[PDB]
Amino acid sequence: PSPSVLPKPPSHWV
Amino acid sequence: LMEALSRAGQEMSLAALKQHDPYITSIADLTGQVALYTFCPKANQWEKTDIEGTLFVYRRSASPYHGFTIVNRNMHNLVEPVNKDLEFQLHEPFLLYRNASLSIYSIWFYDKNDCHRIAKLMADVVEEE
Numbered sequence: 001p002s003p004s005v006l007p008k009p010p011s012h013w014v
Numbered sequence: 015l016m017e018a019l020s021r022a023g024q025e026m027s028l029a030a031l032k033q034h035d036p037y038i039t040s041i042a043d044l045t046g047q048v049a050l051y052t053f054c055p056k057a058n059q060w061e062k063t064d065i066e067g068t069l070f071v072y073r074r075s076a077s078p079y080h081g082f083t084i085v086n087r088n089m090h091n092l093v094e095p096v097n098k099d100l101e102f103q104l105h106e107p108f109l110l111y112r113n114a115s116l117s118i119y120s121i122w123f124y125d126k127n128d129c130h131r132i133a134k135l136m137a138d139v140v141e142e143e
Contacts, residue, residue: 004062007108013118014053
């Protein structure tokens with residue numbers, strides 16, 4: 001189960 | 015035999031899903047192992063949750079006609095209705111999603127054929143709300 005190093009969410013979601 | 019009990023537990027899972035929400039008619043799809051992550055904007059990075067287990071997509075006899083849940087392998091589940099405020103982004107083997115509260119999530123799939131297939135299913139049943 002991957003370290004919390006996933007890809008970034010779509011820019012506009014933040 | 016391993017699959018006999020497999021079929022069995024998918025029968026019991028449906029029922030457990032129903033005792034908590036009776037508008038539920040059937041499981042549309044499920045996966046092996048998935049794990050949940052949430053995005054923290056303040057800190058700007060992903061963060062583990064205590065949620066990891068099996069993902070069920072189910073149908074309901076009343077709007078919202080779809081939902082999905084992660085039954086955890088502690089006892090705290092993920093539960094999420096499939097309405098039109100739900101939006102997805104696929105980045106195999108991760109499936110990102112945002113909901114009404116605007117909170118951001120990622121479902122990591124172990125099996126990346128599950129990831130693709132569920133992502134496809136979601137997209138279909140988001141187009142239907």
